């Protein structure tokens, strides 16, 4: 019976392929709701 | 399911049980028996 835990053998010379990568996943939803996080782009004046 | 099932067996001292694992070095794993970093397989043992 194993409590599901282990530890990566993260060593300096040893790990290639079996090496540590730091991973960041950005998730977002878009064009379906009000928005608060936005591109650098600048507004124009609004013409009717 | 598997294509190429191979099975290996011998006698060791409890001092050497850790030496059977991939990347571990010590005079048994140096000069008697060793296995590749992507070893797709399992170790099993008992006292005798």
Is there a contact between B23 and A9 if contact means CB atoms under 8 Å apart? yes
On chain A, the residues whose CB falls within 8 A of the CB of B23 are 9, 14
Q: Is residue B37 within 8 Å of B22, Cβ to Cβ?
A: yes
B18 in A contact zone (CB under 8 Å): no
- A vs B: CB pairs below 8 A: 5
Phi, psi of B15 (to 5 degrees): -50, -25
A14 interfaces chain B, CB cutoff of 8 Å: yes
Q: Are A8 and A20 in contact (CB under 8 A)?
A: yes
- Partners of B37 on chain A (C-beta within 8 Å) are 17-18
Interface test with B, best of A9, A12, A19 (most B CBs within 10 A): A9
Coil vs helix vs strand at A16:
coil
Resolution in A: 3.0
- CA–CA gap between residue A17 and residue A44 (Å, rounded): 49
Token couple for B15: 């001092």
Angle at B29 between CA B25 and CA B35, to 5 degrees: 100
Q: How far apart, in whole angstroms, are the C-alpha atoms of residue A43 and residue A46? A: 9
Six-digit token pair at A37? 């996080």
According to DSSP H, which parts of A1-48 are helical? none
């Amino acid at each position: 019976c194993y409590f599901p835990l282990r530890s990566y053998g993260f060593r300096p010379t040893y790990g290639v392929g079996h090496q540590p990568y730091r991973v960041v996943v950005l998730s977002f939803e878009l064009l379906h709701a009000p928005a608060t996080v936005c591109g650098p782009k600048k507004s124009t004046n609004l013409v009717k | 399911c598997f294509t190429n099932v191979y099975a290996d067996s011998f006698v060791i001292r409890g001092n050497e049980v850790s030496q059977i694992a991939p990347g571990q070095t010590g005079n048994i794993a140096d000069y008697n028996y060793k296995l590749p970093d992507d070893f797709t397989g399992c170790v099993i043992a008992w006292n005798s």
